């Protein structure tokens, strides 16, 4: 996209220099070893480490000197940008399927009790913890339920409004 | 502009005289039994 790597971008280096300069300008009003001086020094160290880490990660910077993420799985894989969107996509989808499968399993387990509505606002905490730990293996069980036809309710068993 | 007296006649006519007649006639029309 016409971008340049942040490790060689002049705007990136200028932004790091300006942020460090502003923090150092704030730093000179306090005595050495005081709590504000230590806090500002820790902020300066974090700023330097962050700019170094963003430069070392292969991030691409625009004309504004700011990192730009690449989200097409093709351009990310062939140019080393998969850690920006693609691997976070896989991680989020795994965790989201975990949460959804744990909720579905808890709802289905509570459906079989004598008071199904009771477990929805007074949580069965041991059962919820057991079901929550079992959500790690959600893709296998979910894909099997999809192949078996047990994941979906039949259309004849679901209420609809008159058309 | 040519006939520059025309705004001084038509703007009071369209802005004041015509709406007064229009609302009077429409009020008489909507109240008719």
């Amino acid at each position: 996209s016409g971008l340049t790597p942040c490790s060689e971008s002049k705007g990136f280096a200028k932004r790091q220099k300006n942020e460090i300069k502003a923090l150092t300008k704030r730093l000179k009003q306090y005595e050495e070893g005081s709590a504000p001086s230590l806090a500002l020094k820790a902020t300066i160290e974090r700023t330097e480490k962050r700019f170094a880490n963003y430069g070392n990660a292969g991030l691409l910077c625009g004309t504004d000197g700011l990192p730009h993420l690449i989200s097409d799985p093709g351009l990310a894989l062939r140019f080393g940008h998969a850690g920006e969107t693609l691997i976070p996509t896989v991680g989020f989808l795994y965790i989201a399927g975990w949460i959804g499968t744990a909720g579905r399993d808890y709802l289905i387990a509570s459906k079989g009790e004598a008071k199904p509505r009771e477990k929805e606002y007074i949580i069965d905490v041991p059962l919820a913890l057991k079901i929550s730990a079992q959500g790690a293996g959600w893709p296998f069980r979910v894909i099997r339920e999809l192949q078996k036809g047990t994941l979906l309710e039949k259309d004849s068993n679901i209420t609809v409004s008159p058309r | 502009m040519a006939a520059a007296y025309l705004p001084s006649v038509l703007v009071p006519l369209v802005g004041l005289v015509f709406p007064a007649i229009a609302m009077a006639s429409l009020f008489l029309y909507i109240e008719k039994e």
Partner: protein, 41 residues
Amino acid sequence: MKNFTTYLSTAPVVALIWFTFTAGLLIEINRFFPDPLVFSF
């Protein structure tokens, strides 16, 4: 003790405990690993 643990199992208390755990986990991750923007190490 059974009634007290049933009260702790009510939805707002469970939500408070769970969201305290999740928020604390996110806070301590961002404290131990400051400024995470990309999956790069």
